Amino acid sequence: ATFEIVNRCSYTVWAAASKGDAALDAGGRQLNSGESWTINVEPGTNGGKIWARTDCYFDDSGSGICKTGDCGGLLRCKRFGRPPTTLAEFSLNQYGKDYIDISNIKGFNVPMNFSPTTRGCRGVRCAADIVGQCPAKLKAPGGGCNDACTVFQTSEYCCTTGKCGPTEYSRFFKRLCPDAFSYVLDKPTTVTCPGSSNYRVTFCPTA
C-alpha cells in the first residue's frame, strides 16, 4: 500500500514509520513545511505506526536526538518512538480488510489527519490544540502532552491488569479528540477500510 506523508505544519518535522521491530520503507525522513514523502508498506503489515518527531538534530551518519518521538537516536527508525507522540496506526490486509486509527495512548505532539486516498471508508483526525490545553502534570518540557501511563506508571493508567477505566487524564484527550483512542480500553475508534487501500497522513491538517 502507498502512504503519502505530508507536513502541513509551519515547522520541520522528522517523519517516522516503523512496525516496532523494523523500519517501514526508509523508516524516517526530514519534512520541511509543505514537503510530501511517499512510502510503500508491504501488504499484510500488522501493527505499523507513523508519527512526527520535533526538534531533531542528526549528524552525517543519521544519529542524533529529537525532543519528541525519538526512536533510539536514529534518523531512520527501526523501533517505536519515545512519548509524547500522536500515532497513526494501521493493520493491513487482515482477512480482506485494512484497519486504521489515530491514538493518543502515548500522548500528543503534533496534530494529524489520517485519511484513505482510495474509495470506501472515511478518515480520522485529531487536530485540537492538546499541547496548549495540556494539564500541568502531563506537559512535557520537550514540547507535547504526555499520556498518564508514561508520567505516573500505575496499573490504572497503563491498564496493566487488563481492567481499567477512563480517568481524568484520559477524558481530557477524549474531550479534545473524540475520534482518537484516549486509553487502552477506550471504545474503539478504528475505521475499517477495503484491503489494500492507500492513505495520506497529514501533519497539522488545519494549518
Curated annotation (Swiss-Prot):
The keyword Signal applies. InterPro entries: Osmotin/thaumatin-like_sf, Thaumatin, Thaumatin_CS. GO terms for cellular component: cytoplasmic vesicle. The keyword Thylakoid does not apply. Keywords: Cytoplasmic vesicle, Disulfide bond, Signal, Taste-modifying protein. It comes from the Eukaryota. It is found in: Cytoplasmic vesicle. Disulfide bonds join C9-C204, C56-C66, C71-C77, C121-C193, C126-C177, C134-C145, C149-C158, C159-C164. Pfam families: Thaumatin. Its main location: cytoplasm. Taste-modifying protein; intensely sweet-tasting. It is 100000 times sweeter than sucrose on a molar basis. Belongs to the thaumatin family. This is Thaumatin I.
